[PDB]
From a paper:
Phosphoethanolamine (pEtN) cellulose is a naturally occurring modified cellulose produced by several Enterobacteriaceae. Additional subunits include BcsG, a membrane-anchored periplasmic pEtN transferase associated with BcsA, and BcsZ, a periplasmic cellulase of unknown biological function.
To gain experimental insights into the architecture of full-length BcsC and its interaction with cellulose by cryo-EM, we reconstituted the protein into a lipid nanodisc in the absence and the presence of cellotetraose. 4b and S10. The cryo-EM structure of BcsC reveals that its periplasmic domain is flexibly attached to the β-barrel.
Numbering used by the authors: 602 to 615, 618 to 1157
Write the structure that this text describes.
């Protein structure tokens, strides 16, 4: 029977061979069956046979009289087959007809996919109007939302609604947020303990970001002002010090007792659901400035979602690594530092919304700087998390993470020729993160903690690898000094807290605390940020809150 033969083929797709055979079987009894040929085309293009599908679709009878559901499928197929004009005219004919009819599932789907197509067609405003009409059609609201506030508040999530209403809400909210214009200003105070003069780091960073829509994506302009202070050297006597910094180990230094520097950087970039790219500069005003940037591509493969990126970034772990330092004017006066890491990375993830989720990442970078020994690194990271609580407004998870690092050379020292950044020969870390995210009508927050165990080893390294920089007289001394290697393992912990409050439709404020004690020498951060939305966002806030990230940390 035609009905059951059609049903058997259709049930699979909500899958190729059986459905195609069933559709062909219906084609024997009734060669003019429009639904059978539509299903055959759908299954063919689901297999990626676009070239055959576009030829098959032309065999359908004319649209002299057909239901809205069939015309919606035809329009979607034509749009995805690459014939945008026929789909555009079909939707232009369909949408007023959908509006004229009372609220129904057919008309709701027609308006939803029409809004989606119009958003892809290059008319986001008409897409927003069509979404406004679709919410009326889908039963979300009895009356059309006349202003941005009532339009946005209807997009808040609902636990009792069906799939159609939830999809309409999610799509309307996503499009509205994509079309919004945002201005964010954030202040970061960060640093870590160390030795005064080269490692007693305290830094301030003021970040200004403008986010605007462009095509289906968003473009961003970013400006960063960063000030780094590392204290002053402790003089032993006669106004001289002999710390393990620069060439002071060969001759007691003088002159540059205090060390600090500030600079401004710019960045411009763009990002969409698939592609992302960004280019900018190292903060101008430091000793050494280099151009940095990155590009990234993301796509789904099977059940997994993968991302491949290539980037060049600075290292902000210390002043010598980020902006570089100058040797004391009494000994050499030469400039050195400014380590840049350029390389590639590939990441995979799996999360279908259920209780379990996994992710992994691998990266390979080359580290090169001004008068700094060349280096390279390979890094592996992975994580798994089980969601104890997985409500749409409240998530509580506990998981296990693993990290493995290897570096070619250990250049953690601050002597001339070394970059002063952490670089172990073999590092392993296992952590157990516990996380809780929640949001309310006007409050959103995230709390996180993690205990970890880490092992690290570093090899013996010469103190002055760049022998040509050392003066001829000190040569015999410089070859006789080396930094002793060693291995160490132990426990550590990290904690984080994010909070965000909506005080006005166009005004959001938030604070973030990041404490690092996992024996990784990472600096601790404390930031306050304010965000202004031109159109206003009265719907559900971000979960978690999403503060800005310093451009040097990308």
């Amino acid at each position: 029977s035609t009905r059951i033969d059609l049903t058997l083929a259709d049930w699979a797709q909500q899958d190729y061979t059986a459905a195609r055979a069933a559709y062909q079987n219906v084609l024997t009894r009734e060669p003019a069956n429009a639904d059978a040929i539509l299903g055959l085309t759908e299954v063919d293009i689901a297999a990626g046979d676009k070239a055959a599908a576009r030829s098959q679709l032309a065999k359908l009878p004319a649209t002299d009289n057909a239901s809205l559901n069939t015309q919606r499928r035809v329009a979607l197929a034509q749009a995805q087959l690459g014939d945008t004009a026929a789909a555009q005219r079909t939707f232009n004919k369909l949408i007023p007809q959908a509006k004229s009819q009372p609220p129904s599932m057919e008309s709701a789907m027609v308006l939803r996919d029409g809004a989606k197509f119009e958003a892809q067609a290059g008319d986001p405003t008409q897409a927003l109007e069509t979404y406004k009409d679709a919410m009326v059609a889908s039963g979300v609201t009895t009356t059309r939302p006349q202003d941005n506030d009532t339009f946005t508040r209807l997009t808040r999530n609902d636990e009792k609604d069906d799939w159609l209403k939830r999809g309409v809400r999610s799509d309307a909210a996503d499009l509205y947020r994509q079309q919004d214009l945002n201005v964010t200003l954030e202040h970061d105070y960060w640093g870590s303990s160390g030795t005064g003069g080269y490692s007693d780091l305290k830094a301030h960073t003021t970040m200004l970001q403008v986010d605007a829509p462009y095509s289906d994506g968003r473009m961003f302009f970013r400006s960063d002002f960063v000030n780094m202070n590392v204290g002053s050297f402790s003089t032993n006597a006669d106004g001289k010090w002999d710390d393990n910094w620069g060439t002071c180990t060969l001759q007691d230094c003088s002159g540059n007792r205090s060390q600090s520097d500030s600079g401004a950087s710019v960045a411009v970039g763009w990002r969409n659901d698939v592609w992302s790219w960004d280019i900018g500069t190292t903060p101008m005003g430091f000793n050494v400035v280099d151009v940095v940037g990155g590009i990234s591509y993301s796509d789904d493969i099977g059940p997994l979602g993968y991302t491949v990126n290539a980037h060049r970034r600075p290292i902000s772990s210390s002043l010598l690594a980020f902006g570089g330092q100058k040797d004391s004017p009494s000994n050499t006066g030469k400039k050195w530092g400014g380590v840049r890491a350029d390389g590639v990375g590939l990441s995979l993830s799996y999360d279908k919304g259920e209780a379990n989720g996994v992710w992994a990442s691998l990266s390979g970078d080359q580290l090169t700087g001004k008068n700094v020994e060349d280096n390279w690194r390979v890094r592996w990271m992975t994580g798994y998390y089980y969601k104890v609580i997985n409500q749409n407004n409240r998530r509580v998870t506990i998981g296990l993470n693993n990290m493995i690092w290897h570096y070619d050379k250990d250049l953690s020292g601050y002597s001339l020729g070394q970059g002063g950044y952490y670089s172990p020969q073999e590092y392993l870390s296992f952590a157990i993160p516990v996380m809780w995210r929640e949001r309310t009508e006007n409050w959103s927050w995230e709390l996180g903690a993690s205990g970890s165990w880490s092992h690290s080893r570093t090899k013996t390294m010469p103190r002055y690898p760049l022998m040509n920089l050392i003066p001829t007289d000190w040569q015999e001394e410089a070859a006789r000094q080396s930094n002793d290697g060693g291995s160490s393992q132990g426990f550590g912990y990290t904690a984080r807290a994010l909070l965000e409050r909506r005080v006005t439709s166009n005004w959001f404020v938030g604070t973030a605390i990041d404490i690092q004690q996992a024996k990784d020498y990472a600096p601790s951060h404390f930031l306050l940020y304010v965000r202004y939305s031109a159109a206003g966002w009265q719907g559900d806030m971000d979960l978690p809150p999403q503060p800005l990230i310093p451009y040097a940390d990308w």
